[PDB]
Symmetry: D2
Subunit: 337 residues, 4 copies
Amino acid sequence: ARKLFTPITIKDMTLKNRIVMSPMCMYSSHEKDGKLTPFHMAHYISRAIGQVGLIIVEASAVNPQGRITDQDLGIWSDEHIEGFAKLTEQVKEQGSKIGIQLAHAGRKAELEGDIFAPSAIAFDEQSATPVEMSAEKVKETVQEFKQAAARAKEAGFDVIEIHAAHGYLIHEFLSPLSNHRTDEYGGSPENRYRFLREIIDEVKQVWDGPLFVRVSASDYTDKGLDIADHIGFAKWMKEQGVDLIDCSSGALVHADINVFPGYQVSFAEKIREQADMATGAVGMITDGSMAEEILQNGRADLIFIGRELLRDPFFARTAAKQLNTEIPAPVQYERGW
Amino acid sequence: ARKLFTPITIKDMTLKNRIVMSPMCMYSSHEKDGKLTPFHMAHYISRAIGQVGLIIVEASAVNPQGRITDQDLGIWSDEHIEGFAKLTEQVKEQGSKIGIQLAHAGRKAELEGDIFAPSAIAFDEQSATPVEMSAEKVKETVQEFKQAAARAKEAGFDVIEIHAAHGYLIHEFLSPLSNHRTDEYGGSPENRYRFLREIIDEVKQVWDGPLFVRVSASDYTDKGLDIADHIGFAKWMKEQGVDLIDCSSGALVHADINVFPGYQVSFAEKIREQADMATGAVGMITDGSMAEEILQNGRADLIFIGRELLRDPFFARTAAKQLNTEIPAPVQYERGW
Amino acid sequence: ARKLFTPITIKDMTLKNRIVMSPMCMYSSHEKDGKLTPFHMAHYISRAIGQVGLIIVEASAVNPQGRITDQDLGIWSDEHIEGFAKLTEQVKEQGSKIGIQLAHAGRKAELEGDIFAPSAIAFDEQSATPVEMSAEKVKETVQEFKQAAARAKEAGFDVIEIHAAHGYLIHEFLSPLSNHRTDEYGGSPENRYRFLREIIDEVKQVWDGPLFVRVSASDYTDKGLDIADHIGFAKWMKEQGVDLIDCSSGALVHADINVFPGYQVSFAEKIREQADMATGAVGMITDGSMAEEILQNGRADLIFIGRELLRDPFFARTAAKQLNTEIPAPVQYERGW
Amino acid sequence: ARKLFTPITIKDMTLKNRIVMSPMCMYSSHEKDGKLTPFHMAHYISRAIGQVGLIIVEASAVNPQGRITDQDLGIWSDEHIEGFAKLTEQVKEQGSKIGIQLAHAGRKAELEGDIFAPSAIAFDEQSATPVEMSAEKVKETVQEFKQAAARAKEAGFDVIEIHAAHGYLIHEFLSPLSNHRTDEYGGSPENRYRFLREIIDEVKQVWDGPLFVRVSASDYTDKGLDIADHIGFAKWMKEQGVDLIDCSSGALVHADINVFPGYQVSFAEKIREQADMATGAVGMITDGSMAEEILQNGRADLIFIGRELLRDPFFARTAAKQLNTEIPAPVQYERGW
Ligand SMILES: Cc1cc2nc3c(=O)[nH]c(=O)nc-3n(C[C@H](O)[C@H](O)[C@H](O)COP(=O)(O)O)c2cc1C
Ligand SMILES: Cc1cc2nc3c(=O)[nH]c(=O)nc-3n(C[C@H](O)[C@H](O)[C@H](O)COP(=O)(O)O)c2cc1C
Ligand SMILES: Cc1cc2nc3c(=O)[nH]c(=O)nc-3n(C[C@H](O)[C@H](O)[C@H](O)COP(=O)(O)O)c2cc1C
Ligand SMILES: Cc1cc2nc3c(=O)[nH]c(=O)nc-3n(C[C@H](O)[C@H](O)[C@H](O)COP(=O)(O)O)c2cc1C
Ligand SMILES: O=Cc1ccc(O)cc1
Ligand SMILES: O=Cc1ccc(O)cc1
Ligand SMILES: O=Cc1ccc(O)cc1
Ligand SMILES: O=Cc1ccc(O)cc1
């Protein structure tokens, strides 16, 4: 059997294959309340019918002002539990496992009113300057990630992923380019990592299941973070009990990034090798052959697929055919697959 | 531009492209009450996100004993209206038009208790002998199609299609192989067609929107119906106001059928030409090139896609690429399509 | 099995499949003597390795002033026999049958010195006015087609095709738009056809093997030839012993042509049905599904492939895969096909 | 521009792209004289028309008894120069560069009469036991590689590759599993490498152009050679002036090899990184995406394609389309590509 379609167990969770639907914002919560809509349901459940091993729900704000846009999904209120409970149940019924990405847009939040970050530094020339979070505010935000995780557990999610990438709040604390704080949350790598450290420990108090952390393995910028920095954070996350690091990159500030098939794979491979940590590979992986190569050559443990799953919801089937293998089809499509 | 992606107007309905999702039973009404389930919602709505011009909902029984299986959808009760109302609303929200196939399995019903047909002739050796419908029972069934159409209109459907194919009730009345009646519903081509004639006229009393009729253009059997017979029926349907004939074939009785890409297209083109009736082509059509060829060579007006839409929900996108053309993507997928 | 990959016998010739490499000028006779070059050898033989059932060599001029360009292949000299003999031998060694298209560009010849045609009417504004052939010149040309056919037979070709399409010499005689003669070669459909009639009869005197004739089934021009005219010609060719009509279209004069997948298939099916003549379909056919549909629906007997064989020399293999079937691979590629 | 289609200069040779047709035996020298045939010409030249940057001709024996089979190509005689001269000229004319793989089958030679190897050990239970080469015979074989290289230069080849892989002669000397010699050519890694060392130095005396060496980076067998051993040989080859190491693997003896897309890439990456030597990656690479990933992530310098070039001679075009880029088409196919 192909490794891509070989099961894997993480904590109490067993995925039927190594294909993961990468979290992707749909900006479709038109009521601006962070709640799910019929579109979200059809969008996610169709990939479950499509046999994706694990579906990670798009960035979901742990605080309303932590949304990227007012059309984002949210999990800052118990009122968000009802909808998510229906989603997890329906995705699970099709045979897929489901996760949610807990997030906070930080200085990249496109909302009216003050937005927050570790330091009052704008993302770019077009962005509003954020307010530096008070130590009190930082600690309250840590509690919001914990509270959000508790809601995700109640909602029935199998995995929880902390969004510590793409220039958002946590990433902003991690990088010296965006974190100029003079308190316990800034300075040394230990201090810059403190925010994430506290989030992981608190989430641990309410969630014992699989815990992923998505990082931007590089800032591709002089004086910014690079893979060496992230290998360091990874070892600390391993000690804290993080099960897998979802390896993305960039977006802290505009930068020149050479994009190509598997351009972020080196990050997943190095963290896996040097930090002895399971990793998720993502970034222009669009066919089963590359997915299989990545896994067989020990470059990552899970293959995150984003845009290809937008073009082909049934990528699992397509990948199976490309690898000349067979996978179970959803019962209702037996006469077509 | 490509004809396949050029709008077409039928009555007061305008389709953005000429791709139609052929009706396909999902056997997922697990409560056996003919109601829709979350699976049906994700199943159909995902193809609307996928830009299918017109989605025809699977065979929905106009009478509980007219279901193929107890897992079929139904529209024999006002209780079915609420669910269908949500479905049409959500499918239309994506930009697709939606239709429903009104059906009655006749002697091919796989249910407990008496099953009905024009004559007491079983489908095959493994099938129960059906009860010959009394003239009044035939009339009650006509009213049930009428009542079902009224519910469909209320639920918000854009198109209504009468299932007069695949060996089910109406087809059974149409063919001399299954209809041996000597009353007003049998004996001559006109009388064998009477049941359908009354159904069309009655549906017209409560529905003046697009009206489709799916037929099995041939029984592929000696003494059975052939394309010449259906060209005759098409002429009569034209006079009655039918807008398009969905051209399928077979299934009245077991027969040896040579299946291949476009094996039913000749039926669609002959009826279109000889009956001056718009037609829908269906059967082993799996790529944009053939779809465009059928439309451009005037063989049909709409291209019905079945199994390829089970393998690839976003066939519209794939076909556009194959035809070296571009179509609008759902807003949420602009970064991937 | 698939019809596309089922053998077919024409006269004493049996093709292993029904895929034909449509004649395509390579403009590679750099010494301007009409002789073959190493490029031509690799070009044609690679498609034989590729399992194409029948390979038709590009337009080969029966007279030097009948070439389209001075870079064309020729067969107006016994000096051309040696090269063609090597080509047929090597192509047949792979299992493919081979044919040659005998041609004469007429008024579309892009050469220095007088060019000829049935009437002194130029192709367009950027073309030289041709010399009206004297009756004797017409007769000499008929003999040149005969002599060319004799050379083709000697060189080992399996099939001979007369190029009576694309606005070249024979086509020019056939259409009233380009033929205004009032002698035995003009004035009525019979007289306009006379040139072709004499060519067929004379070729028959030295060649009794498969004989094809490529025509432009329509001029797409008011007062020009249309499919009705060609069905008439096909009936006459049938009487003369022509085995198959290769159905192309246009090019006599500039015209607006709606091109799409299978845009010339209607010509092939109408002639096949109304003239009871075997036909070759060509024009935007790029995949196995359409090829099979054309054959199974009785629209043509052979599928001519042009540009797709330039993009994919091994189209036979690709088509087999698309049709979920398998064909024998050349022995040398058994480990790859 | 994509790296796969970015030129690279090695010595005095510039390749227009990084795609290389991996050497592949055709067993088509039916006259058993090691000479080329029309099949070989069409086979190789078609990939040149297909735009492959570099075409490596199949294993060509430096001694008749060094052939794998009596149908192999040879270069053990000046009589082989004439044919090769025509091949290199024609491949170069299409715009591709060409190389030849100098080889000696050793104990895997399937010929009548004594076969040779470093030690009298059979390849497997089905094979004949080879005769241990005398020291004199070994040195004569070194001279045969030199003499063959001289013929390749005269024939017009751009690159010469030494076949030191797949269980053949040189590989047999390199591995302790097959080399039990007690003289200067056996024992220590220095002694086991001596045969290849002498071949490289002698070839250098007659050839100053690009020099490749293909190795089996692992024997996948206990007590056999592994990547660590080959990294060692690579450093020595670097010192000797070898320009690139073509990284294959296995075939010294039967072994359990886990085959998958890019399964030999780790070898190319490690040798490149640790030996500071340019490398060629090969082994189930069938699409442009993986080819691009390998190059962009610095895993190899050239992408060798084998079986995919047997299925798709115009893989370069296919890969270009997969990478959404454009490459020049052969002039004759401008209207198809
Ligand atoms: C429309 C869209 C929405 C996205 N939303 C998210 C998100 O909420 N969280 C996240 O971590 N990444 C997000 N991403 C990044 C993707 O998950 C993925 O890592 C990226 O596209 C690289 O992979 P791909 O080449 O497979 O698409 C998004 C990308 C797109 C195109
Ligand atoms: C699982 C399944 C369910 C189907 N259900 C229906 C149905 O409810 N009504 C109908 O008219 N045809 C039904 N069909 C026939 C299809 O609509 C379609 O006409 C047929 O599959 C031929 O087209 P295709 O080759 O595009 O699939 C079904 C076919 C399949 C495979
Ligand atoms: C480069 C090129 C050369 C051609 N040469 C010839 C020729 O010599 N004789 C002929 O009858 N048609 C010729 N044609 C027309 C083709 O044979 C074929 O009928 C046409 O391209 C339509 O088919 P296709 O879509 O499969 O390419 C040529 C077309 C191209 C693009
Ligand atoms: C029919 C055939 C012939 C081959 N001949 C040779 C050869 O002469 N020399 C060599 O080094 N490898 C030879 N190989 C191995 C290939 O060059 C290539 O390295 C191998 O197939 C792995 O790559 P692929 O997956 O791209 O085919 C051959 C393979 C096949 C299938
Ligand atoms: O909407 C795009 C998006 C990209 C990356 C993220 O992390 C979040 C949103
Ligand atoms: O489930 C298959 C099916 C086929 C044709 C129909 O019409 C109804 C159901
Ligand atoms: O080169 C294009 C060409 C087209 C049609 C012909 O018949 C001859 C040449
Ligand atoms: O013919 C297959 C073959 C494989 C590997 C080699 O090295 C030589 C020949």
